[PDB]
Ligand binder design. Structure first.
Ligand code: AGS
Ligand code: AGS
Ligand code: MG
Lengths: 452, 452
């Protein structure tokens, strides 16, 4: 009804990700009646659109064993689009791909320990030779060479984001091995999927922020001015900063984060100037989102605030909010856990004049949040998260996160006989058997707390 | 059960310290069936790990009169390892010891009064001649030379912490005699044995701080993010700073202490910079503990704080807490006696989101604390500390330390007839008979207070 902006919407090119029979990194497979519909001939370089901004460029081939409404892609392409099997992706015709002449690729440290020999010769040259491979900037791809397989990251390309690797292409691979931890931090960058029990609020945020920015034509056509200040409020640990992260990673808009304490940490004036810079920055990068995290830190009630610099900063902000003209295309988002401690002048018409209530999650919310928190956790057969969702009435996302963290620690406590703090590293067998049981959760639960 | 992180854990190399029959400083003795098990041949240089970070490097030889599960070492090695007879120590193979070419050794002032002659010639040369002695930095060893025996400290070594003293080694011994008081402060540096009635809290600290730092694999494997801010709270004098000292001395982690008042004592901005420096330092020294003692001094509720600089420092801290990325491996500990006067933003998820309650000790707690406080005291046959533990309901460890101090002063008051303030030094006999009687404690008890 109102959640309508979030609905999947069936389209010719919106296809379910299936496991590949053609195991090559550069190839995706569609059924023959699907290729005909989109007017995609055999061998055409296509543009795939995943989750969290992510893209990949592939060659399309026919497949008999593949379904009409499905697309076949291997683990690498799925990883690059940040999608698990049975996720929807957009396939797009991509006939504008120029042949690259300079690509910079770098291996991943943990997949490269012992004997360098030559990385280009043993790995990259047999991978690319006469293959006319499409690759995107930021693609993590795997190459096999004798003893074992090495993962590589595409760091730079010759045309802007993507190119075909012709025999012309100089394949630079000199430099520092990419730290595994950087790409773990990149894989586990927050998306809309990482935020649970906020469906109707995520709808509001797309309505108030994403829709006026990426489709301002609607608002101008309907003769209505888009709201320009969206305040997210709610109790401590409900997901405001997470939604902030998610928005930052999921929007097409340019995103500028301002942390409340971050601003107030800095010297008198040097903080007024940083705000100024943030608003001029957003203006400069046409369609933008300014996120002011912890608004209450920078904008408290001009009455209940003793310092002149502090009183000046609230004035500096109001001026900037009013200073953005209609044709700026900048939406200011803010988060707080004490909305009633913000200067009401900021919450007036034209400033933060729309409120999104990130409240306490319902039983279904808690289940979502538990599902998101345990996605990378080894859980036992007996763990019932619907049970955990029901026994956690007072719990916000942060509480449940801690709950899972404690339940994990209890599982570690159970394994403390075969572990010692004095050992250099932990025994191999002991590490694999680590599973968080339901009995662990029941111990976490017994120790649990709300904050509210 | 939860105390499991603290259990001793039987290993091949974990051995009980027995008195040496081989009286030489460089030598430890094991039974023949124990040397076989650990694959340690005769004469091999080994690494011994005692209490409170302390290590010694020694030669291993067989002994018939020594038990299988025991290790024979003289007073000097035991001192260096900070162990009484019948403590557990790690013995470790150590074949990577290069011959040192420059060692700096200094005598201890009270063991060196009268006739220098030549310290190296009379003492150190016969001690090292063709001996191929393993020594570590910070070893205090004793040497005999005609008239008497002199103690020496190893101040500096040629390879990093330890080396073999070959006939190549220049043994420098020029410099100031090491003050006995320095090494008394070093012997009596606080460890986990010096802290009592906090068994379950100490378990918590090892879980939350030591375990994620020295074994981050567990948390990554189990799919759980380690907590990064641990707040110790409780009433005045309960052991927080003591635990801070014990942790500093007992961890494998690099440790950085920030005292609340120490920070607030410094000029405006020059304090923000010292906070900045501390966090950067901890980050720089890979696995680290930052301890902010008296947190309430630096982070009070941003409302109930009048000064702009003070408000700025709270913002500076929060920023740093949030500034440490996942892959930093820095846990921040803090202590307070007024937890409810700390800005709540600091106590939220991701910040100091874990609390350890160092509370009032029970009867068994008080007993532990009295046993720790009297370990260096001369006590009478009639002194019953269980009786004292039971008579002290309101007492925290600080009250008990004061209680022990007063009972000692009373024992001194009893000995005032044979002592006078006007004398140059106190009579020899008088000093030895000094024993703190139970009657002294009953006086101390009669005068005692809680912080009521
Ligand atoms: N609705 C949610 N869905 C999924 N995870 C959540 C949610 N709410 C909280 N979490 C988890 O809890 C953590 C803390 O949530 P934050 O977004 O930092 O809290 P917050 O709403 O910003 O609270 P304040 O106002 O800063 S105290 C996140 O890193 C998530 O792991
Ligand atoms: N649990 C304990 N075990 C052994 N000694 C203790 C204990 N608690 C206190 N003491 C003694 O009392 C002294 C003071 O304790 P501190 O750790 O300095 O107090 P604290 O808990 O830091 O209290 P605040 O909040 O600073 S007043 C220590 O130096 C110890 O000698
Ligand atoms: Mg203290």
């Amino acid at each position: 009804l109102s959640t309508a902006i979030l609905k999947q919407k069936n389209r010719p090119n919106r296809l379910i990700v299936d496991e590949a029979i053609n195991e090559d990194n550069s190839v995706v497979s569609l059924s023959q009646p699907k290729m005909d519909e989109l007017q995609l001939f055999r061998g055409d370089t296509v543009l795939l659109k995943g989750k969290k901004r992510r893209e990949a460029v592939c060659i399309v081939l026919s497949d008999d064993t593949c379904s009409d409404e499905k697309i076949r892609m291997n683990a690498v392409v799925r990883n690059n689009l940040r999608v698990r099997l049975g996720d929807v992706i957009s396939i797009q015709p991509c006939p504008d791909v120029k042949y690259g002449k300079r690509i910079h690729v770098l291996p991943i440290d943990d997949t490269v320990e012992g004997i360098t020999g030559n990385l280009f010769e043993v790995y990259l040259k047999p991978y690319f030779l006469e293959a006319y491979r499409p690759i995107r900037k930021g693609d993590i791809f795997l190459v096999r060479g004798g003893m074992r397989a090495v993962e590589f990251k595409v760091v730079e390309t010759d045309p802007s984001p993507y190119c075909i690797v012709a025999p012309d292409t100089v394949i630079h691979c000199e430099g520092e091995p990419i730290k595994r931890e950087d790409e773990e931090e990149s894989l586990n960058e927050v998306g809309y999927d990482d935020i649970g029990g906020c469906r109707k609020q995520l709808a509001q945020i797309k309505e108030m922020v994403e829709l006026p920015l990426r489709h301002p034509a609607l608002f101008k056509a309907i003769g209505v001015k888009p709201p320009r200040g969206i305040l997210l409020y709610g109790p401590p640990g409900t997901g405001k900063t997470l939604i902030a992260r998610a928005v930052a990673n999921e929007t097409g808009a340019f995103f500028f984060l301002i942390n409340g304490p971050e601003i107030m940490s800095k010297l008198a004036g040097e903080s007024e100037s940083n705000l100024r810079k943030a608003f001029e920055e957003a203006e400069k990068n046409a369609p933008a989102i300014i996120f002011i995290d912890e608004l209450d830190a920078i904008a408290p009630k001009r009455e209940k605030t003793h310092g002149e610099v502090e009183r000046r900063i609230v004035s500096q902000l109001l001026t900037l909010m009013d200073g953005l003209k209609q044709r700026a295309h900048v939406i200011v988002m803010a988060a707080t856990n004490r909305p009633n401690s913000i200067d009401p002048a900021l919450r007036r018409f034209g400033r933060f004049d729309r409120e999104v209530d990130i409240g306490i999650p319902d039983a279904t919310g808690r289940l979502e949040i538990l599902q998101i928190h345990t996605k990378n956790m080894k859980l036992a057969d007996d763990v019932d998260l619907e049970q955990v969702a029901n026994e956690t009435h007072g719990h916000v996302g942060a509480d449940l996160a801690a709950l899972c963290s404690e339940a994990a620690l209890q599982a570690i406590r159970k394994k403390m006989d075969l572990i010692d703090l004095e050992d250099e590293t932990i025994d191999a067998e002991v590490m694999n058997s680590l599973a968080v049981t339901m009995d662990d959760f029941r111990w976490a639960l017994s120790q649990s707390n709300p904050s509210a």
